[model samples]
Target: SSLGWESLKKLLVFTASGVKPQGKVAAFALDGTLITTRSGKVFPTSPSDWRILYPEIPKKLQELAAEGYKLVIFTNQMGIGRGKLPAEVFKGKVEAVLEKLGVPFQVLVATHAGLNRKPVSGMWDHLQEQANEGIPISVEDSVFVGDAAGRLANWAPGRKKKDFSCADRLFALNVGLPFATPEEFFLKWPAARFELPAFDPRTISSAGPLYLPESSSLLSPNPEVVVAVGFPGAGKSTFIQEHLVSAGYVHVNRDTLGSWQRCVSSCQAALRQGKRVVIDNTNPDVPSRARYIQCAKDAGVPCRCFNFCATIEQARHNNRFREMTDPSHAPVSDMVMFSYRKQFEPPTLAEGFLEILEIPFRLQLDPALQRLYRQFSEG
Candidate 1:
């Protein structure tokens, strides 16, 4: 009979006679694979504290164990061999973890050089010998998982001839076990090759809600400053003019601030008195917009940015109308309009604006009435 189900069952029955069942054995490596450690560092003095170090680990380990695989931890603590920390300190951390999770493992071995370090068959060989004595592990059924490199090649310091790379590869072939980096092994590889369990958030209850408070809210009121951002020829000036003349908003222009020295002072005065202020300027760049948002934040008032975007054609048309209608000023050339379009940079979300309102190019206002209103409003 080949090592089929029936033959395996019979072998298991015979093996179980007069000896405790060794159970299914699976191996996991420490360090980058399980817990991340600083370079050239040993396990921390307290493993209980170490438990907090990688909060995501215990749950993953428990999930693996519940599937009926015996958990075995194989670690290489070269620090112990090098006398970084006493063996007792490292053992305490490991033991504390087992105690906290309440999942008893079949075995936990920490090796320093002589045979147990991964990529070497000594530790695996020892486990195999133990399994043969009473516990049985089908090499075909077992898997070795580890994440030696944390996706960053620069992590390992020495590129000398003697390194764990050779040992890790050799061990996998010798054990007849498949090998994969933790990222490739667990995430991309398993999904591509094996049956991947559907990701149901409820199955992993410990993970908190995905929504964030900042994502839900619109109004972020601060007492510090105000910023207005919009495209060129987007009626930014008209909006500011309306607010200053009608809406009781203080209009602070850079020219009035005398070489931009008193601009901060003017903003501070408005904020001190609890007044809504509007800074009138073409804030096209990120740094320029940020300066105003920072001011709003410092003032402890709500900061909002209004973005007025009009199509280039519309802007050019408006400029033509303004030039043709005005008796004193000459008509703007196409070159001037092109220059204006070239210099414009649209505002983005990263500017920390609470809200952005986009204005349509062709507004519903009567052209004659709008011209009259602009003349009167400016005058």
Candidate 2:
């Protein structure tokens, strides 16, 4: 109980205390997927504040273990990151639950937000390396279950709250594994009400645009304003560097400029100097996009939105790939993606765009790397 967060930060094999990890994985999310907060507050107030969610949980897990699957729990504890709850307190709850399952299992807790959280495969990968002892894992044979699956905002009476985020569903997608909600996984509840994920990472495997805008020219020769609009990690930066830069477009990402106001100032400077400009940021909703659009109108040039055809899953995929290769780039958190979707308003012609072309996403990278990236992207 007195251990530092650092000591508890990585993979923690609680139940299967002394065995080497083996076979295919039966991974799960902890809080909502395995058990709900008995206290009914956002977080438990005590280490013993949870109960087994279902009677079937134990026997089902035992069945998986009997069938040669390694039972593991992967959970994100942002409360620890926020300094609201102690990591030791979380570990105690984890210990209690896995003991009740009575099957030898391992629980991996990502104590903070950045590297080891759900929607990022760091924990899953770490377990395979540190715990699995280099044992090969078959993606087809593994499954991940979690509760946050982008469900509709209606559960409790008169409470209109959407599921917090799609980290668990996206988490499975990240690891090249099939995903399930707690309802489907345990309750045999096949028909829960839900909304489709704002961005589906699975679309990355499909070739070409879902359907191109059909009859829109995306490129231009003269000075123009190009706005990149999509979820974060949607390859907007990559698309601008490869497709638009050759046409005299100078990148004006808000990330570098510090704010949209500053980005608009830079865009004006570029237009005044007669250089074309590309705003490479999420520009998630109409208001965010309008700042750049208005700047283009004032400068008397065409402004087109290259709506990068990157889904939520694709954006997360792009971030994971970047995080793995380039340490300079920080890991993208699921919370940031959630905020973007929260304020999302798709770009419409009513917003005064000269053209809104669907920029189809392709690997568009080194062939050797493409093969490797596709393994995770499609998986």
Candidate 3:
């Protein structure tokens, strides 16, 4: 009973209908693969109960679909054979199962004849005929996956009473395909989960104002005493040079302070006369910032602390380039980045600042800053 090369090829052509099958076409045994029956009665009559029986079938079916396999379900409905369950009822159950899994079968064949139960090729014949019409089936390109052992007596008339099996028929068909146990089928099934597509920033813009406390309209009159606190290389000095100087505020940096005591006294004087002033310093440490806040408070004028917190890594990297370009006037020392890392204190809302603004950097110009800049760039 050897299937010679030509014979095997012809058999394959017949099963596959002259079209080379791409992947395996699996035949699932309904009773075992889908659900277990007790004395010919399916325990879970409700869809919910059926789902509990084969919780993994739906997901596994979807995985098979994703892998480009044509799936089919073949079942032997003994209850139908015994006239206990109607064919329409069984078909409806199968339909519900397919819908829940979000996949459709190429073929669903159920035989009511007890002797014609699977491992016998009656249902397989139904599948083969359907496959011949542009659809294809072949053992080499497919497999019959089920839990039963094809024993004729268990299903066929007058044969030795035995359990069922698909082995003999699969061997007779000589499809030269492999077989999979229920567990093995699931293990090889494609995963049920998929990553969501990336989000588009443009969509976010179309949605409009994502944050509350909407952008303020009333800009504060330049405060008489403004203490700018931020980490080193956070554009603290650059901000003061551009804004405070043009606004007529006396800009004082820690490096330019001839005497700490005298500078504090001057800050107080500016506040007393209602003249705007800005303390331009890294103010990395908490104690140093407290001193400025106290001086503004003593002068009886409004005090605003502007914390310029940016990504420390970018600040440090930029600082390196700045030092190379102008060593003499670079705003920070070699240890400035490390020092800020050691002493940086994030300002809190409870600290009583009238406003806390977070301005991030631009990404393209400065990749780190870009992330921060994008946060506030949307209209």
- Maximum-lDDT candidate: 2
Which lDDT values do the candidates have, in the order given? 0.51, 0.73, 0.52
Determine the C-alpha RMSD for candidate 3 after optimal superposition of all C-alphas.
24.0
Per-residue lDDT of candidate 1, residues 1-379 (tens digit): 1111111110110111122334565566655565554333444444343432345556765776777666665555667666775666666565555565455543334334333444445566666674446666776776776644213232224422222343333355446666555545444433112211122111212133221232442222334344555444545666567644355677777646785447877887888986777777656667667767777777767666655555555554444445434455444466755665666567766677766555444432465535322221100
Q: Could you estimate the TM-score for every candidate?
A: 0.36, 0.62, 0.38
Error of 1 at 132 (Å): 6.8
**For residues 264-310, could you state the per-residue lDDT of candidate 3 as single tens digits?**
98887776666788888877666877777677667656566666645
Model 2 lDDT tens row, 1-379: 2221235454344545534467689988888778876787776667787877777788788788888888888888777778787877777777678667777677777766554777767787788876677898887898998877767666535438777877877677767788788778887876457665544444445365532576655567678898888888776766677677866688787877877668788899989987888888888898888888899999999888788776677778778777655667767788988899899888887898887888776665576445446433211
Candidate order by lDDT, decreasing, is 2, 3, 1
Query: Which sections of candidate 1 miss by over 4 Å?
Result: 1-23, 37-49, 52-56, 131-133, 149-169, 185-379
**Number of backbone collisions per candidate, in order?**
19, 3, 12
